[PDB]
Design a protein around this ligand. Sequence first.
Ligand SMILES: OC[C@H]1O[C@@H](O[C@H]2[C@H](O)[C@@H](O)[C@H](O[C@H]3[C@H](O)[C@@H](O)[C@H](O)O[C@@H]3CO)O[C@@H]2CO)[C@H](O)[C@@H](O)[C@@H]1O
Ligand SMILES: [Ca+2]
Length: 769
Amino acid sequence: DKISHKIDIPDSAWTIGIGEKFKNAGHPNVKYPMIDDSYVQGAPLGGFGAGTIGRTYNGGFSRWHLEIGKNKYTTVYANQFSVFQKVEGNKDGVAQVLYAGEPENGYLSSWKWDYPKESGMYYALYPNSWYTYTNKDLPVQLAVKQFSPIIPYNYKETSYPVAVFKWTAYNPTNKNVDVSIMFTWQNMIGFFGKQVNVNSGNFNKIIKDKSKDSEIVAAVMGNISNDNEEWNGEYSIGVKKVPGVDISYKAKFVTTGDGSDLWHEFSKNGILDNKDDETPTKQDGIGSAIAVNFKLQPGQTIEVPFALSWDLPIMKFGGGDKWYKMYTKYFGKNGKNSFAILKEALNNYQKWEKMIDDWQKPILSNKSKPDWYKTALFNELYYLADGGTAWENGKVGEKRTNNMFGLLGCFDYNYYETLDVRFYGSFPLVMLWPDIEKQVMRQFADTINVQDSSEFKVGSNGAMAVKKVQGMIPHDLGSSYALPWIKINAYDWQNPNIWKDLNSKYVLLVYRDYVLTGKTDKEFLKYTWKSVKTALDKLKEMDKDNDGIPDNEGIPDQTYDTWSMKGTSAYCGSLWLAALKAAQEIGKVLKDNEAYIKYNEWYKIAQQNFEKELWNGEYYNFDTESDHKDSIMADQLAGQWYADILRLGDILPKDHVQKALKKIYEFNVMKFENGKMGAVNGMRPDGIVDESDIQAQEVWTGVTYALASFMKYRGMTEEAYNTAYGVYKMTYDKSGKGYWFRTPEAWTKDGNYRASMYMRPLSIWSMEV
Ligand SMILES: OC[C@H]1O[C@@H](O[C@H]2[C@H](O)[C@@H](O)[C@H](O[C@H]3[C@H](O)[C@@H](O)[C@H](O)O[C@@H]3CO)O[C@@H]2CO)[C@H](O)[C@@H](O)[C@@H]1O
Ligand SMILES: [Ca+2]
């Protein structure tokens, strides 16, 4: 490996061998069907709301999130980079697809598949990833850096449906070598969204943009139809000329054939026919190829940028609504703009690399923090783009000031902005994209007094319940299978209108978003103030025994939605105390004296009673009335955690908080698989895991990272990082369960999982406050 020194991969990048087999991988631990796409994954390409494309460590374009809200795992075999090399003085060269695998059937059988093991590495530090190719039959060593311009405090480039591939080639040998690099792409119009005739009318054109000291050659893969539909638009691939390289191309090869129409050209001398051909296809799949060829002398290095764009302007949800994607603000809505997007990327990628370095540097250059923590911190952010992210620039047919946004809680439970989850998972948005975060919270504010009296069947018990009650915060803002932003509370496993955490979490989210953006945005507090008061006042009515605290009803009426709470719970009770304190503070800021006084009175009664009812000498009891009321809950002081972040002070005595955190570390972490797997949710005082429900026996990745944050602010530095380390280990390490780029909600002691690709572990960013 002589290529690594010619590029700059950070030491904290997650790494794996190209073609590496992983033997320890986990699988779903539930009885019902659940997504399991294997450990063959990688860092996604594509901006927020653009649709994303997962290119795996093996080289394949395999995890398709282009249909917004859907996850489709299938390798499109025509989508590859290939290499040709010929040593000066040999008769023949060699050609190889840079993919550690081969197709399942006979399409593209002529290509050279099965890139060999032990011949290259994959590296990821989101939003960048890299592949190196150090192969004994390839005398020139190659590497590529691939990325999309995901940039904090930037709402423009961050939205683009574009990827850059910056290639570096180096000749360490003592002979001249001819090298070609070829990008192939299938015209994927009709891959989704088209009910019949899936390739019909697809056609490919070549654009040569020559303008002084710039040459771009690109393929635009579109359809003859000008229909404005979810399925229609363009894909583009291309390359920018640099000194010392020639460009060649082929507009049309057949993907549903043996591939030899292209491969016979590339395998001879790495130079394509330059055959333009705009003939549309009927039933056959088609694609395009863009290639560079160059001669490398001994010791010579060259850099060449390629790019990929996709202009699919319309997203459609299962309920029938069609919206424009955010990026259409910058490029247009007509679906004929893939080349403009590609050209912007090819002409500006160096600036974008620097912008990315500028935001990663403060963390990467802090040598008090271990590399493993940086690996997790950056790579967990994959989910902001990969979580079915929806970001609208108008409904099709209909202009507003704001652009509505939604991130899925996960794919198995397909709900937007699941609020009990975003309490943990929204930290990256408030810290790095606060205008999106405040938009999402205004979306929730607007729903507070919505009433929907129609009834749905509650999944857990079969009872009928009202869809949406006035004054109760919704569980979510809809499903991608239905109508995001329009029909809320798609979730139906329990009735969220009787949940005891949603209304408090909502208030705490609101005050967080003011505090973490500088305590300046009074207009945001004003917009949300009525909803905050309404939310707290409605939750107070759920206090059954006049102790000043809402009563859990002996059912799972909160985020742990199979784990029953009854009476005063540590979890919902602490959240209530914190929410009251936040509302007092907002009352002072806005000069609402009667609110300050009311919430101050409620707070002091509830605080007293919380302490009397739950404090046992060592920790706070799980609740006042359940069968395992004395279980040690990992999340027992969630309200005090948020109070620390919000700078609201002590809601409970410092001494008791410290004792409770130490107990949690001693029990829920250290007595669960030797503290190498996170914090198990429920432990009995005898040190055996609580067996009252599956969720008690699960480690929750986002709860664990948030508990790490809490420990860190309380000066328990070693405990904090050791607690977090088990999550990192299980997710990324060779000794873990293979969950890189699909961090789940939960695992049990055997390491098997529930709900891969989950929002909650984005809470690792609470460790950076
Ligand atoms: O909907 C989201 C919630 O899902 C919960 O899992 C439940 C499944 O949604 C549900 O389909 C499954 O149904 C069981 C059913 O209860 C049982 O009687 C029958 O015999 O088998 C069905 C599955 O084959 O129940 C599970 C609960 O066990 C998650 O637990 C929850 O966290 C999530 O929000
Ligand atoms: Ca009560």
